[PDB]
Write an enzyme that holds these catalytic residues in place. Structure first.
Site, short mmCIF file in Angstrom:
data_model
loop_
_atom_site.label_atom_id
_atom_site.label_comp_id
_atom_site.label_asym_id
_atom_site.label_seq_id
_atom_site.Cartn_x
_atom_site.Cartn_y
_atom_site.Cartn_z
N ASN A 191 -0.84 -0.45 12.58
CA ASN A 191 -1.48 -1.45 13.62
C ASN A 191 -3.22 -1.51 13.19
O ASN A 191 -3.50 -0.67 12.34
CB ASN A 191 -1.43 -0.96 14.83
N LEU A 198 -1.18 11.15 13.50
CA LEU A 198 -1.05 9.75 14.03
C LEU A 198 -0.43 9.76 15.37
O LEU A 198 -0.08 8.41 15.86
CB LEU A 198 -0.40 8.88 12.86
N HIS A 208 0.45 5.25 16.87
CA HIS A 208 1.31 4.36 16.04
C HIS A 208 2.55 4.77 16.57
O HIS A 208 3.14 5.94 17.02
CB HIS A 208 1.26 4.77 14.65
N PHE A 248 5.47 1.50 8.22
CA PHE A 248 5.26 2.52 7.01
C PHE A 248 6.45 3.33 7.17
O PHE A 248 6.97 3.78 8.42
CB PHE A 248 3.81 3.18 6.98
N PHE A 265 1.46 10.89 1.60
CA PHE A 265 1.12 10.15 2.72
C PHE A 265 2.39 9.41 3.33
O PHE A 265 3.12 9.74 4.09
CB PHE A 265 -0.04 9.59 2.63
N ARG A 286 0.83 -1.16 -0.13
CA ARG A 286 -0.04 0.08 0.09
C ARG A 286 0.58 1.13 -0.06
O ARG A 286 1.86 1.32 0.84
CB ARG A 286 -0.75 0.08 1.27
N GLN A 327 3.86 1.57 2.94
CA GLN A 327 3.54 0.65 3.76
C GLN A 327 3.91 -0.82 3.42
O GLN A 327 3.65 -1.09 2.41
CB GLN A 327 2.29 0.70 4.23
C1 LIG Z 1 -0.81 5.06 8.16
C2 LIG Z 1 -0.59 3.47 7.60
N1 LIG Z 1 -1.39 2.70 8.60
N2 LIG Z 1 -0.63 2.13 9.80
N3 LIG Z 1 -1.74 1.22 10.06
C3 LIG Z 1 -2.69 0.97 9.44
N4 LIG Z 1 -3.87 0.44 9.51
C4 LIG Z 1 -5.06 0.35 8.75
O1 LIG Z 1 -4.98 1.28 8.00
C5 LIG Z 1 -6.01 -0.60 9.24
C6 LIG Z 1 -5.86 -1.89 9.74
C7 LIG Z 1 -6.88 -2.54 9.90
C8 LIG Z 1 -7.85 -2.15 9.12
S1 LIG Z 1 -7.41 -0.47 8.32
N5 LIG Z 1 -2.50 2.04 8.28
#
Ligand SMILES: CCn1nnc(NC(=O)c2cccs2)n1
Length: 164
Positions: free
Chosen positions: A101, A121, A125, A112, A59, A54, A62
């Protein structure tokens, strides 16, 4: 000292170069050690051969789902998941390295690398390092992403390990 680790990244099999990361073990030793060991593969599993699944321009990029390759999986060196160690380090700008997470206390192997300040965030995170060298390689990765996060080429961590 704090570990210095690397990721060598390909797009459709063609090398893009190397990303060098400092892991801030002096602030988050458990989180830094998980990432370090997944780079070396010394536990018998890790990031080598897995993908950036992703990538959203302006942004973050990941990666780290080496079980399902789609953002649903991964595992830590301790077990499936481990707690949020602390939120001392913040998402200050491009180049920050942070844990992905699915809510509180769900860290595994996904992570990421930020391409902008992602301060919204903070406190959610666990930040554990930053890019020392190869932000130009990160920008190359970013250029193969899209607003949905789907990549237009297969982005693979060809090799990874520890430098010091
Ligand atoms: C900023 C990047 N990033 N960090 N953690 C996530 N997790 C999610 O987006 C999701 C997890 C479960 C459903 S959606 N994205």
């Amino acid at each position: 000292g704090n570990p210095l680790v690397y990721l060598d990244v390909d797009a459709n099999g063609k090398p893009l170069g190397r990303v060098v990361l400092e892991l801030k073990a002096d602030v988050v030793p458990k989180t830094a050690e998980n990432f370090r060991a997944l780079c070396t593969g010394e536990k018998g599993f890790g990031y080598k051969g897995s993908t950036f699944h992703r990538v959203i321009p302006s942004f973050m990029c990941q990666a780290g789902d080496f079980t399902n390759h789609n953002g649903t999986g991964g595992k830590s060196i301790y077990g499936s998941r481990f707690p949020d160690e602390n939120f001392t380090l913040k998402h200050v700008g491009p180049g920050v390295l942070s844990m992905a997470n699915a809510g509180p206390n769900t860290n595994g192997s996904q992570f990421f690398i930020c391409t902008i300040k992602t301060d919204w965030l903070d406190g959610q995170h666990v930040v554990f390092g930053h890019v020392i060298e190869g932000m130009d390689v990160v920008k190359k990765i970013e250029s193969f992403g899209s607003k949905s996060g789907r990549t237009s080429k297969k982005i693979v961590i060809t090799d990874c390990g520890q430098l010091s």
